[PDB]
Paper text:
Saccharomyces cerevisiae prevents uncontrolled retrotransposition of Ty1 subfamilies using distinct mechanisms: canonical Ty1 is inhibited by a self-encoded restriction factor, p22/p18, whereas Ty1’ is inhibited by an endogenized restriction factor, Drt2. The minimal inhibitory fragment of both restriction factors (p18m and Drt2m) is a conserved C-terminal capsid domain. Structural and genetic analyses of p18m reveal that p18m and Ty1 Gag interact through a hydrophobic region that is shared between both proteins, termed the Dimer-1 interface. These observations suggest a lattice-poisoning model of restriction by p18m in which the CTD binds full-length Gag and forms dead-end intermediates in VLP assembly.
Drt2 also associates with Ty1’ Gag while forming VLPs and likely uses a lattice-poisoning mechanism to restrict retrotransposition. Inspection of the location of these divergent residues reveals that in p18m and Drt2m the three divergent residues lie at the center of the hydrophobic Dimer-1 interface. Thus, this “arginine-flip” mechanism provides a further level of discrimination and specificity between AVL and VTF Dimer-1 interfaces.
Author numbering:
A (entry chain B): 262 to 350
B (entry chain A): 261 to 350
The structure:
Amino acid sequence: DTQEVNDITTLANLHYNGSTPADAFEAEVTNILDRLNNNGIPINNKVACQFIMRGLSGEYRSLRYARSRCINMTVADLFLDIHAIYEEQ
Amino acid sequence: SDTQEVNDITTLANLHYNGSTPADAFEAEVTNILDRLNNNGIPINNKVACQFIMRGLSGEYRSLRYARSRCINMTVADLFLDIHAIYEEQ
């Protein structure tokens, strides 16, 4: 009953600093976006990008410098950058 | 401006009302958030909007959360009337 509200809240309160696997973070955010699109709440690529960048902490905060191109960025590309920084760790 | 949708969704997720501000301004802020989100392509159902507004109710207005069983059964307008009733009584 609250699946949409909890998913939107978790999308709004994303937080990543590299202490957990970047692949798991990517997959769980993708599940949030997928359940929200199936429940009637479409999240554009720019909006999902903005949320994920607001959630990046630590070295990943560096990625926020590209936040001007959140429209030009892709959720997949941002997730790949996160995976690269995580592989460097 | 570019992040307007994210800011509106964040404000909708962290609503907070306890009666210290006018209920008209609170209703207006919730309605503006919902309207901008629907105009930008993010439709918030009546049940979802009710759940969001009720999660924010504090103080005596916490009593209103007891009607949370009727989220689909209740419109945003009815919740706003309840909030206005408690505020006018205060």
